[PDB]
């Protein structure tokens with residue numbers, strides 16, 4: 046206690062500066078800085094030593110005098126207040142969302158300054174991680190992945206774009222497709238991003254973007270993989286959220302000529318938009334450029350939505366310019382808009398119960414126009430559309446549908462059409478930068494981040510499961526495999542105990558008894574029930590740590606068979622299971638599929654082709670496991686994005702919110718491991734072998750281990766900076782620049798170091 050300031054708990058800041066006045070047996074007595082007398086108690090566990098200079102920060106948290114969760118937090122906070130959003134933990138990068146545009150840190154000049162630079166020789170930056178992946182790709186001859194993680198709104202998508210800009214601008218061609226990988230983005234975001242209450246630009250699908258390289262290590266092309274577009278959003282949103290951006294970009298920015306041809310109007314006029322928020326993102330100027338006939342009553346009364354990045358009218362323009370830069374012609378552009386508008390009109394079709402015997406329903410007379418616009422835009426016969434929406438084929442006979450069923454059919458058609466449109470968009474983007482062969486790639490992974498709301502459904506379940514898989518890859522690669530390597534090599538590093546989540550994964554995906562398999566079972570039963578599925582889950586996993594029955598409120602609560610709590614690595618989430626069975630089924634009824642494949646329009650037909658049950662859950666599992674196989678085969682780098690607060694505002698560091706993210710991400714565990722661990726390593730026989738042919742007949746040439754030691758000394762290392770295992774030599778944090786020199790294989794460099802080594806062994 047003698048006699049310095051310490052860190053101790055604080056409910057909103059995470060930690061606070063205090064002094065140890067009295068020392069009890071199980072607890073200490075703390076006086077908060079500048080409050081003498083208004084003390085409080087804290088368990089000895091909960092109190093940590095502080096850095097002596099509180100206004101100074103370090104670039105790598107491994108450089109702190111005391112490595113702990115409170116000093117890590119403070120160091121991040123101080124850098125944040127100076128608008129420095131990036132900090133290292135050894136070779137892992139931490140990125141806190143600034144929520145404003147920090148001048149010049151992403152400029153061309155900044156890009157240039159990071160090229161070829163070793164980690165630790167420039168300030169922490171996403172560009173440095175990207176450059177590191179490129180350098181390792183060449184030197185190790187090994188494909189690379191950059192994994193960007195974080196909860197919704199933390200900055201994964203922005204940082205993914207920074208990485209892609211850096212690599213194509215630095216190692217591209219300066220010709221055409223260098224820009225194309227970058228310029229594709231606004232196109233994918235227009236179709237796949239939407240306003241949620243957590244992020245005005247939320248990604249509603251995951252992606253892995255690969256940049257492929259030739260053997261001379263120049264960019265030859267790209268490939269974008271995409272995962273599970275959120276479907277429900279297409280037809281209904283909550284009052285503060287929107288549908289995908291493209292719908293508002295079109296309504297706001299389309300020319301009068303296009304608006305008329307697509308028969309568009311203000312967003313309040315469409316069921317598929319009008320339960321959600323119908324306001325545009327716009328500012329004082331861009332609002333002048335949006336015509337009055339585009340503005341809903343909500344918009345005229347409350348004004349525009351504000352975001353420092355999004356602008357519906359401006360983004361429509363940028364999106365069209367992007368389409369042209371990547372080689373989409375005006376014809377293809379209008380084809381896309383036609384399908385979008387065609388989906389809008391489809392949602393405006395309503396039904397009414399029919400008078401006849403064994404009757405279903407008819408289109409309401411006031412729906413006649415929507416039916417007309419819809420059929421024209423999709424190349425369909427009105428009568429065919431009418432029959433496909435109001436009847437069902439089933440043995441040969443046609444069955445009338447009730448109004449609800451017709452509602453469901455209308456929406457199923459809309460979801461499949463929009464979803465196939467999205468697939469078409471991704472594939473068209475891939476055709477923008479194709480390639481025939483490549484040597485290696487650098488891939489950047491950007492998933493939909495961890496999220497939860499008042500009510501969570503199948504959509505959140507799939508998203509959070511994807512996040513759980515990603516954290517497990519992080520756990521496996523960084524915390525598990527690392528410590529096992531230290532042990533197999535004989536290093537004697539103190540085991541670091543960490544929170545593993547394989548059990549959460551097993552709960553979801555295990556054969557027969559995993560949640561996904563039990564759900565599939567229910568789809569295949571004679572009379573499928575959300576309640577039966579939910580009971581079976583609880584039954585099969587009574588007392589599992591990661592599953593729980595909802596708790597019941599006395600202030601509406603959720604019954605045993607109406608939901609469950611999953612304890613995800615990022616916190617517990619309560620899912621309502623209604624509609625889990627229906628949402629788990631991806632098959633489209635024959636009558637609807639056939640309607641579409643017979644469109645007059647080639648473009649429409651080609652979206653589909655050049656009890657049927659299909660599992661959404663299991664298809665997604667299969668895709669993620671293929672992704673996982675690919676990541677395992679690469680060198681992986683990690684960027685942990687952090688959301689500073691819940692209001693999307695700059696300069697509001699919420700200490701406790703941020704601490705919790707540092708804790709569940711495993712970054713606190715990594716910092717602990719780096720106290721005694723080694724982020725770099727190389728086989729010493731391999732080092733020796735690479736130098737051998739430049740070595741004269743001297744002591745150095747006879748003994749590989751002694752040669753490596755002399756090499757290390759000649760590049761400035763001492764005994765404390767490295768350690769020999771059984772087959773590899775390991776290097777401490779802070780020595781990345783020296784490690785790169787050790788690994789370098791340029792013949793002139795080797796010959797030079799040989800000359801120095803022989804002086805060290807004379």
Ligand SMILES: Nc1ncnc2c1ncn2[C@@H]1O[C@H](COP(=O)(O)OP(=O)(O)O)[C@@H](O)[C@H]1O
Pocket residue numbers: 142143144145146147195196197198199200201202203204244246247248353354494686
């Ligand atoms: N480095 C950054 N610079 C400026 N703005 C940022 C940065 N990172 C995030 N943002 C802002 O945060 C919002 C949410 O970030 P995004 O990357 O969309 O989150 P997610 O992690 O869900 O992908 C962005 O639309 C942008 O306004």
Ligand code: VO4
Pocket residue numbers: 195196197198199201202243244246247248249492493494495
């Ligand atoms: O708000 V995010 O792009 O993690 O879905």
Ligand SMILES: [Mg+2]
Pocket residue numbers: 201202203246247248491492493
């Ligand atoms: Mg995103």
